[PDB]
Write an enzyme that holds these catalytic residues in place. Structure first.
Site, short mmCIF file in Angstrom:
data_model
loop_
_atom_site.label_atom_id
_atom_site.label_comp_id
_atom_site.label_asym_id
_atom_site.label_seq_id
_atom_site.Cartn_x
_atom_site.Cartn_y
_atom_site.Cartn_z
N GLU A 155 0.70 -1.11 0.55
CA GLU A 155 0.17 -0.13 0.07
C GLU A 155 0.95 1.10 -0.08
OE1 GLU A 155 -0.68 2.15 2.80
OE2 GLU A 155 -2.21 3.23 1.77
N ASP A 210 -8.29 1.39 7.89
CA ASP A 210 -7.08 2.28 8.39
C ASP A 210 -6.90 3.32 8.96
OD1 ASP A 210 -4.35 2.81 7.37
OD2 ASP A 210 -5.20 3.61 5.19
C1 LIG Z 1 -2.13 14.63 8.02
O1 LIG Z 1 -3.52 14.49 7.27
C2 LIG Z 1 -3.48 13.77 5.69
C3 LIG Z 1 -2.86 13.71 4.80
C4 LIG Z 1 -3.46 13.17 3.66
C5 LIG Z 1 -4.12 12.78 3.27
N1 LIG Z 1 -4.85 12.68 1.91
C6 LIG Z 1 -4.50 11.53 1.78
S1 LIG Z 1 -4.69 10.90 0.12
N2 LIG Z 1 -3.72 10.46 2.39
C7 LIG Z 1 -3.16 9.01 1.85
C8 LIG Z 1 -3.90 8.34 2.06
C9 LIG Z 1 -2.92 6.90 2.57
N3 LIG Z 1 -3.15 6.37 4.00
C10 LIG Z 1 -2.77 4.63 3.68
C11 LIG Z 1 -2.05 4.66 5.46
N4 LIG Z 1 -1.49 5.95 5.54
C12 LIG Z 1 -2.22 6.96 4.62
C13 LIG Z 1 -4.92 13.05 4.37
C14 LIG Z 1 -5.14 12.74 5.79
O2 LIG Z 1 -5.91 13.91 6.45
C15 LIG Z 1 -7.51 13.55 6.05
#
Ligand SMILES: COc1ccc(NC(=S)NCCCn2ccnc2)cc1OC
Length: 325
Positions: A155, A210
């Protein structure tokens, strides 16, 4: 429109039983200890975690398959293995619960990813083990519905997240299943109005966990398609609080993890390649992300155990209601 399966509300007796946590706490934590290790793709420990999942579930008599391949990454060629466990393989429709079992290769140091996603991994195994008797009984009904667990590999990006550097396991699996042709006549007890042309059509709904394990997650309905399923989660949470079965700081508080509203937010995750292929998604991911997200503080001590117990109750009650255990 209408959800294709009529969703029978859990009897109060079953809610209460599903909302009791014993040694249950102890079983979950013993399972979780196996995931609380760095599990970067390519690593021996990632192999051991994969082998742990496989063995736990074969010990439960599930059909366990591994979708292994090598893929090009910004760090060169890499081995990936998705893990797919299916309670009743011949059942036409699957309730799919999912998460990813690899951990981010963090350049600042050793990253455990306790919420991301050691906890979801444990919760999936803990569901299988704790519901096993009921699941084994449900499997004999011939009702055309089963439980499937998918533990996605790769992932996380190796470098800066991109369409080509992320979701390796889920992109590969969605493709493989989509091109795998089947039909309703080949399968056991498909619903009446079913259009099955390939394996991807048998995923009745994918419930993607997740970033779980931090205190006070806030969830929302990210998809109109699955709003009837999401609402069962809202309702279940509500009845557990009415029952006094939720662990809180003080008396007379209620959990409100599943917000009864929807957000306009777009999160990239392992659901994406399935969404593109019309799989209904319930994305059980908090917004905002935990504060520890992608930091070295995403570790065992920063987990909030009462929230984890509360979630485990909701998930057990939910799966019991969906499969009518
Ligand atoms: C820090 O806060 C954020 C940072 C980025 C995003 N947007 C996306 S699309 N992130 C990729 C998520 C994928 N992923 C799976 C496991 N860990 C992460 C949203 C956030 O808060 C809503």
């Amino acid at each position: 429109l209408k959800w294709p399966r009529d969703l029978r509300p859990l009897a109060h007796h079953d809610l209460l039983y599903m909302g009791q946590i014993s040694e249950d706490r102890g079983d979950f934590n013993a399972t979780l200890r196996n995931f609380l290790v760095p599990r970067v793709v390519g690593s021996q420990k990632h192999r051991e975690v994969r082998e742990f999942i496989v063995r736990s579930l074969k010990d439960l008599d599930w059909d366990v398959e591994e979708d292994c391949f090598d893929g090009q990454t910004p760090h060169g060629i890499k081995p990936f293995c998705n893990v797919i466990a299916t309670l009743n393989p011949s059942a036409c429709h699957r309730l799919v619960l999912a998460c990813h079992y690899d951990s981010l290769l963090h350049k600042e140091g050793t990253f455990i990813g306790a919420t991301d996603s050691a906890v979801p991994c444990a919760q999936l195994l803990y569901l299988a083990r704790s519901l096993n008797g009921k699941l084994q009984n449900q499997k004999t009904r011939g009702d055309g519905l089963t439980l499937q667990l998918v533990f996605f590999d790769g992932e996380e990006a190796f470098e800066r997240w991109s369409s080509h550097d992320s979701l390796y396991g889920s992109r590969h699996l969605a493709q493989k299943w989509h091109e795998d042709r089947t039909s309703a006549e080949r399968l056991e007890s498909c619903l009446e109005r079913s259009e099955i042309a390939n394996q991807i059509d048998r995923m009745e709904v994918m419930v993607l966990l997740d970033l779980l394990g931090a205190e006070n997650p806030r969830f929302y309905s990210y998809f109109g398609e699955t709003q009837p399923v999401y609402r069962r989660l809202v309702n279940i949470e509500s009845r557990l609080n009415d029952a006094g079965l939720m662990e809180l700081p003080r008396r007379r508080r209620r959990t409100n993890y599943f917000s009864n509203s929807s957000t306009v937010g777009f999160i990239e995750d392992d659901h994406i390649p399935f969404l593109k292929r019309s799989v209904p998604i319930v994305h059980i991911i908090p917004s905002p992300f935990p504060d520890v997200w992608h930091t070295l503080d995403d570790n065992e001590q920063n987990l909030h155990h009462p929230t984890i117990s509360n979630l485990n109750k909701i998930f057990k009650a939910f799966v019991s209601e969906y499969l009518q255990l």
